[PDB]
Amino acid sequence: DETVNSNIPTNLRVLRSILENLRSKIQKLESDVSAQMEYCRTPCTVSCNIPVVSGKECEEIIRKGGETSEMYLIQPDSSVKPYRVYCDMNTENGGWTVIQNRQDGSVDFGRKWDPYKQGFGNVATNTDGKNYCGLPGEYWLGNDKISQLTRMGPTELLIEMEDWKGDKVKAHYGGFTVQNEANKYQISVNKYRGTAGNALMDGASQLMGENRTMTIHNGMFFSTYDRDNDGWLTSDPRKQCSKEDGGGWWYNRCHAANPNGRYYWGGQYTWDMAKHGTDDGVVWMNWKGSWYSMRKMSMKIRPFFP
């Protein structure tokens, strides 16, 4: 009771400072959310005049003269109406249709099954005072559309990423396909080459035996936080790979990479930052390892001409 009754007074002032510190932070935040709510009383807007040249997909478009990377209109098949897409016409000979793109966290990626089915986000934006949209936005083309494209014929997949120090690596896949909804958009890939680490087919580098194998994405089904189709078998509604606000991906048990994860600014992040203390976030372990969100990440496809 000598100094003990001194340790107590120390906590009654320490705890007191924190609790009153936090209560004020709560106030600052409540304020920030109200301003943003006011900014949402109106939307952002784009003026994307549509290019004339068009076709089944970006490869055909570039073969018709479309040589500038921007938003184009494409009709992969005469059944469904034509849709907007972003064409990368410079990266490795061009002709790439962008199916996924992350670059600034302007778009929520933690969505339910239906939005991942139809697609969401912004395809393109207006560039330095111009009538056309030459810069891509953040978007996920949509499972249905991606499946239809990869099945039209041999499709190759190019995955690009950048960290917060400007470093860039890439993952190539000469063969890539995605079945339809009835088959849970099951994914299959092959013929790897790159500098990012074949995380899709071999699972995370820093893992051994079954611990690594369970991080293989190839052959996995697609799951959203409201639709479990992962490699985790159990009745434990807690062990699932995709929790709320988590992205939709070809999760297994659980991942080596997740291009559709939350966009953490700065890169590194801790367990006491993650809503569920799980490794959600633009991850690609085989390069930057676990708990590190990329600054830029994209997925592009192109017909594969042997």
Binding site: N5, S6, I8, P9, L12, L15, R16, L19, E20, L22, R23, I26, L29, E30, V33, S34, Q36, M37, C40, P43, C44, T45, V46, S47, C48, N49, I50, P51, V52, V53, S54, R63, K64, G65, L73, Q75, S78, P82, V107, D108, R111, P115, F120, G121, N122, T125, N131, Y132, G137, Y139
Partner: protein, 298 residues
């Protein structure tokens, strides 16, 4: 400096207050954060859109209701797939389907065969962008079963003066015949019948060297003119060249209007010229070529 140890019990409960109070404010905040997130799911609104109304051409569409200009999807009878076009509807129910446009030189018209076939440029609701629909598409629209068409060449100089030149039975052929332009007759217009030829005084055959009716399309990588050389490669464009022209709306867009032989290492008259309305050294400020069923042109 440490107060009475009887204060503890009180102070212990007071911290418990600002702790539970905080946790509550945190629950209320997390609900507000949910609402905010639900207001940030939509994408940016695009000012440009494409009407759901469709048809064989812009006229077929208007005869269906289309009341305002803007991008539409048409699919001529013998066409494989549908494609986007810029329909022009006026206060009379006329649906002009436009295939060429100039208004600021924001589009380089020096393109090849493929490009001139598939089309280049941009379409827009406000009809404020330059483009070239594409020979193949222009061909499908003007050769639909038994439907005679009419072309109207609307011009404008740098002063708000605007003339026009209408040609009846306008028609463009298939690649097999090099997208050949043909028409039955000049149907009027203060712009003048440039397609018929023009006598510049440079040669006794000028007229013969500058008529466009029956001329095949030509681009630099596909010389189909009536000259020893390459008209298209000289003027740097794609057009129904002869030897070479009297009306060239796909020319180099010279800013201001006036230019001369001091404009090129060979002093070519490669501007948007229409000889019967202005001198071959005066590139227009605007240009627009649109077609519509002939049996509609009053």
């Amino acid at each position: 400096y440490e107060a009475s140890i009887l204060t503890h019990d009180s102070s212990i409960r007071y911290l418990q207050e600002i702790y539970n109070s905080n946790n509550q404010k945190i629950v209320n905040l997390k609900e507000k954060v949910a609402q905010l997130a639900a207001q940030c799911q939509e994408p940016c609104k695009d000012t440009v859109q494409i009407h759901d109304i469709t048809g064989k051409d812009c006229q077929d569409i208007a005869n269906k209701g289309a009341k305002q200009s803007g991008l539409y999807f048409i699919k001529p009878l013998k066409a494989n797939q549908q494609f986007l076009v810029y329909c022009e509807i006026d206060g009379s129910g006329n649906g002009w389907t436009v295939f060429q446009k100039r208004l600021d030189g924001s589009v380089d018209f020096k393109k090849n065969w493929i490009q001139y076939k598939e089309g280049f440029g941009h379409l827009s609701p406000t009809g404020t962008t330059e483009f070239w629909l594409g020979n193949e598409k222009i061909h499908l629209i003007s050769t639909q079963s038994a439907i005679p068409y009419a072309l109207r060449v609307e011009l404008e100089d740098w002063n708000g003066r605007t003339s026009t030149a209408d040609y009846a039975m306008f028609k463009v052929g298939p690649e097999a015949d090099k997208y050949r332009l043909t028409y039955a007759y000049f149907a009027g217009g203060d712009a003048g019948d440039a397609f018929d030829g023009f006598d510049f005084g440079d040669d006794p055959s000028d007229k013969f060297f500058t008529s466009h009716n029956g001329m095949q399309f030509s681009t630099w990588d596909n010389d189909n003119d009536k000259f020893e050389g390459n008209c298209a490669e000289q003027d740097g464009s794609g057009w129904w060249m002869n030897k070479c022209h009297a009306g060239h709306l796909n020319g180099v867009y010279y800013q201001g209007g006036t230019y001369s032989k001091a404009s090129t290492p060979n002093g070519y008259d490669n501007g948007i010229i229409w000889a019967t309305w202005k001198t071959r050294w005066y590139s227009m400020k605007k240009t627009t070529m649109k077609i519509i069923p002939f049996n509609r042109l009053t």
